[PDB]
Design a protein around this ligand. Structure first.
Ligand code: SAH
Ligand code: FPP
Ligand code: MG
Length: 296
C-alpha cells in the first residue's frame, strides 16, 4: 500500500517514466541484480571480493557516499526522505544504517516500484518505519507533517529524469522541508561538454530510459545553490571506467537472461544505452557525480 499525493499541476513527463519502470521486477533483478540498485557502483572497495556484481558495486558506492556525507556524531536523524525511491533498497539500507530513525519516507511516480517496495519492506519488517507516497518530486511540499523537517535526503539517479523546470521547482520545495544542517546525498549523470557540442555515439530516437533532459556540472550545481543549499563536496564518483563496467556487466546480464522476443522494451533501451554511454564515459564526455549538499 502507498498514499497518493497530487499537486493539481501534473508533469507531462510522468507517462514516459511510468513506462520505463512498469515491468516485472523479477526481469529487472536479472538485469541489475537482486537488490535492484539502479545508480551504478564502485569496483575499488578493498572489502569487495571479485567477481564484483552490480549488487556489491552499488552497495559500496552508497557506503562511499555515506562516508563523504560524514556518517562514518552525525547529528539528529529522526526523519529521512528518499526521492525517486526505485524498488526500495535505498530506504531499507538507510533504515538498517539509522536504527534510531523511526520515520523514512519514499516518493516515486512508478506504481509498480511502490507495489514491490511495500512487499519487500514487509518481508524485512520495516512497514511501520517506512512510508511510501505516489508523489512527484515537485509535490514534496504536500508530504504530511511539515512540522517534522527532514534530517537526511537521498536523490540518487532521479534528477536525470527531470526537465530543468521540474528540477528547479523540486529542489526549492525540497530545501523548504529541510532542518538547518540537514544533509542531501545526490548521485547523477552529467555531460562534461557543452550540450550543443555533445553527439550521441548511438543515435537515441526513442529517449532511452527517460534520460533525454541532459545537464552540465555547472548548471546542476547552480540550481542547488539558487535553492539555498551549500555544496560541501562535488566529485566524479564512481570513476568513468566503473560506470562503464556496471553498464557492460548489466548488458551481459540482459543478453544472457533474455532474447529479442521476451526482453521488456525498457531493458532493450538499457542494453543499447550500455555501449553508447560506456563509449561517452571512456571519452570523458559524461561522468557520474557524487554531491553532498546541506541546508545552512
Ligand atoms: N519526477 C519524479 N518524481 C518522483 N520520482 C521520480 C520522478 N522521476 C523519476 N522518478 C523516479 O526516480 C527513479 C529513477 S531510478 C533510481 C532509483 C533509486 N534512486 C536507486 O538508486 O536505485 C525511479 O524510481 C523513478 O520512477
Ligand atoms: C536513469 C538514472 C539516472 C538512474 C540510474 C541508472 C542509470 C542507468 C543511469 C542513466 C544515466 C544516463 C543519463 C544515461 C543516458 O544514456 P542515453 O543513451 O540516453 O544517452 P544520450 O541519449 O544522451 O546519448
Ligand atoms: Mg538519451
Amino acid at each position: 500500500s502507498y498514499h497518493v499525493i497530487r499537486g493539481a499541476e501534473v508533469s507531462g513527463y510522468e507517462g514516459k517514466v511510468v513506462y520505463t519502470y512498469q515491468d516485472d521486477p523479477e526481469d529487472w533483478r536479472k538485469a541489475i541484480g537482486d537488490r535492484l540498485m539502479f545508480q551504478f557502483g564502485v569496483y575499488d572497495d578493498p572489502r569487495s571480493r571479485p567477481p564484483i556484481s552490480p549488487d556489491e558495486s552499488g552497495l559500496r558506492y552508497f557506503d562511499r557516499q555515506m562516508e563523504l556525507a560524514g556518517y562514518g556524531d552525525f547529528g539528529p536523524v529522526k526523519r529521512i526522505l528518499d526521492v525517486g525511491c526505485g524498488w526500495g533498497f535505498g530506504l531499507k539500507y538507510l533504515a538498517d544504517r539509522f536504527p534510531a530513525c523511526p520515520r523514512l519516507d519514499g516518493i516515486n511516480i512508478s506504481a509498480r516500484q511502490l507495489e514491490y517496495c511495500a512487499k519487500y519492506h514487509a518481508e524485512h519488517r520495516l512497514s511501520e518505519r517506512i512510508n511510501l507516497y505516489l508523489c512527484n518530486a515537485q509535490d514534496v511540499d504536500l508530504l504530511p507533517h511539515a512540522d517534522e523537517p527532514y534530517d537526511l535526503v537521498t536523490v540518487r539517479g532521479v534528477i536525470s529524469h527531470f526537465p530543468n523546470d521540474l528540477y528547479e521547482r523540486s529542489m526549492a520545495k525540497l530545501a523548504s522541508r529541510l532542518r538547518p544542517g540537514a544533509t542531501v546525498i545526490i548521485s547523477d549523470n552529467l555531460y562534461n561538454l557543452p550540450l550543443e557540442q555533445y553527439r550521441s555515439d548511438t543515435a537515441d530516437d526513442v529517449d532511452r530510459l527517460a534520460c533525454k533532459h541532459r545537464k552540465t556540472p555547472g548548471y546542476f550545481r547552480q540550481v542547488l545553490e539558487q535553492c539555498g543549499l551549500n555544496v560541501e563536496d562535488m566529485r566524479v564518483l564512481p570513476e568513468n571506467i566503473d560506470v562503464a563496467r556496471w553498464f557492460m556487466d548489466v548488458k551481459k546480464n540482459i543478453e544472457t537472461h533474455f532474447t529479442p522476443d521476451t526482453i521488456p522494451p525498457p531493458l532493450e533501451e538499457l542494453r543499447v544505452m550500455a555501449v553508447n554511454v560506456s563509449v561517452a564515459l571512456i571519452k570523458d564526455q559524461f561522468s557520474t557525480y557524487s554531491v553532498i549538499a546541506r541546508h545552512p
